Amino acid sequence: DDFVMVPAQFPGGSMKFVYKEEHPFEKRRSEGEKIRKKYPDRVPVIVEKAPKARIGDLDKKKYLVPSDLTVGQFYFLIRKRIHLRAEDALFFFVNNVIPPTSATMGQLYQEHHEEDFFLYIAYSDESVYGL
């Protein structure tokens, strides 16, 4: 009867990550399934610098994040890990879009997790992914 109202702001596609190139899909997927069962109130997240970003790199890519943590809290966390200056910008991208700062990480996971059961976030100094 009714139409599915496809959102005007629908995401882009998945993004390339060095992490996905360096860890075979079936190994990631098996790990993701297991970590979701072990910590069901947390979400597994891979965080990587976007292509062409001019910003410090993380020493750790893998984060197990409480599902109620907001995207804003996760920005605050990442800023501190790379000692961003007060005047430095930080943008996240999931499936090519900037996620809402007020979303929870659990909400982002539900909408954007990939087939390996991970959520992938790219970060940048720029507001356009890959620029």
Residue numbers in the entry: -13 to 117
Paper text:
The canonical LIR motif is a small Θ0-X1-X2-Γ3 motif, where Θ represents an aromatic residue (W/F/Y) and Γ an aliphatic residue (L/V/I) (whose side chains bind to hydrophobic pocket 1 (HP1) and HP2 of the LIR docking site (LDS), respectively) and X represents any amino acid (aa). In this study, we examined the molecular determinants that regulate selective binding of the centriolar satellite (CS) marker protein PCM1 (pericentriolar material 1) and the ULK1 complex to GABARAPs.
Our affinity measurements showed that the LIR motifs of ATG13 and ULK1 exhibited very strong binding affinities for GABARAP. In order to find out whether their C-terminal regions are contributing to GABARAP binding in a similar way as observed for PCM1, we determined the crystal structure of ATG13441–454 and ULK1354–366 LIR motifs bound to GABARAP at a resolution of 1.14 and 1.07 Å, respectively. In the N terminus, the main chain of the aspartate in position X−2 (D442ATG13 and D355ULK1) formed a hydrogen bond with K48GAB from HP1. F364ULK1 in position X7 formed an extended hydrophobic interaction with L55GAB, F62GAB, and L63GAB (similarly to L1961PCM1). This interaction was further stabilized by P365ULK1 in position X8, which was packed against F62GAB side chain and formed hydrophobic contacts with F364ULK1. Thus F364ULK1 was sandwiched between P365ULK1 and L55GAB/F62GAB/ L63GAB. A361ULK1, the corresponding X5 residue in the ULK1 LIR, made hydrophobic contact only with P52GAB.
